[PDB]
Amino acid sequence: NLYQFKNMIKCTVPSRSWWDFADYGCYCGRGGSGTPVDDLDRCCQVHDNCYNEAEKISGCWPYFKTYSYECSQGTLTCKGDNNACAASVCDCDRLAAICFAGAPYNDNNYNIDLKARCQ
Amino acid sequence: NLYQFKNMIKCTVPSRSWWDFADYGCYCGRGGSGTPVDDLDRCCQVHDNCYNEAEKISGCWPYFKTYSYECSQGTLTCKGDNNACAASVCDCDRLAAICFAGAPYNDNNYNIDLKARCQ
Amino acid sequence: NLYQFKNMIKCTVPSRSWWDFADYGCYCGRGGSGTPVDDLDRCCQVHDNCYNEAEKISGCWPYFKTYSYECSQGTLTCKGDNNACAASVCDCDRLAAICFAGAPYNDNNYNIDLKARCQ
């Protein structure tokens, strides 16, 4: 679910606040249109597409689905004790947190003019 | 629930991204104040007033309530197998999707200055 | 849960729309960074820090957690029939509603430029 996602980002990017990734570029937080403005914005794009596919599973609502995982000092792991929906969602989240960790964060791409910068 | 509403707009307005209607005018997405800037903004205002009514039912939280419906090729239907809350929310959503479908989408009314344009 | 919080602000600040507090300052709605621009923005900051603490309880997701409370003519009360998570979240919400009620609402701090105004 949304809270567990927030907690994965904390695992991999402890230095940053979850709020920083909530309104970044064209895909982080909101977004589904434009072109990723940068690497991090692309991570968000990819996570978006990932959630899309998980939704193709009946009764799978990504932000509401609680899954089983563990953060062990910068390391994320989704557990086996998850159903199809929980398993797919945890992997999307897990991969987005890792992506956020190796993508540089540009301040100027934070809280941008969607209309002006996103197709 | 929120995911099912997103999927209704997909049913009727396949050509557009659900994110397009997430920050449009004064009422789409956010909003509850101003005067609809256009037809589509009005749809959103009506949906909002519809949700308000649905909340008058004890324990009815519109964005969380999962209902039963079906999209069959541009055609929406709310099923009978819904309790009062589910039934009322599906109706609000189903009507907003159809509204969105016959209301023109103006780019400039996307991601506008709320303060400047909404009372 | 999120709906119940909305209804608490209605109890204490009937005159205002819940949407007014949804994008105010640096912490109302979004936010977790900057410095409260004003009293109300501080309320939101405190609520935020309150939610953080409540999350320290296993399985406690503040916006999803339904609690038991009552608004009795501008008066909020959290009931005893709440588990630890419900009890802690209701308290955060109840205190935010009261805070909102005694904090002045400045129009210009509504829907501001986060980048420009929030560190």
Question: Could you give a short description of this structure?
Answer:
Three copies of one chain form a homotrimer. Chain A is mainly alpha-helical and 119 residues long.
Write up what this structure looks like:
Three copies of one chain form a homotrimer. Chain A has a single domain, classed as Phospholipase A2 (Up-down Bundle), CATH 1.20.90.10. Chain A has 119 residues and is mainly alpha-helical. Helix content of chain A is 42%, strand content 5%. The relative contact order of chain A is 0.23. Chain A has a two-stranded antiparallel sheet. Chain A contains four helices and two strands. The radius of gyration of chain A is 14 Å and the shape is globular. Chain A has helices at residues 2-12, 39-54, 84-102, 114-117, and strands at 69-71, 76-78. Chains in contact: A-B, A-C, B-C. The A-B interface holds A 30-33, 55, 61-64, 113-115 and B 1-3, 17-20, 22-23, 64, 107-108, 110-111. Chains A, B, C: Disulfide bonds join 11-71, 26-118, 28-44, 43-99, 50-92, 60-85, 78-90. Chains A, B, C: It is an enzyme of class 3 (hydrolase). Chains A, B, C: Homotrimer. Chains A, B, C: The active site is at residues 47, 93. Chains A, B, C: Belongs to the phospholipase A2 family. Group I subfamily. D49 sub-subfamily.
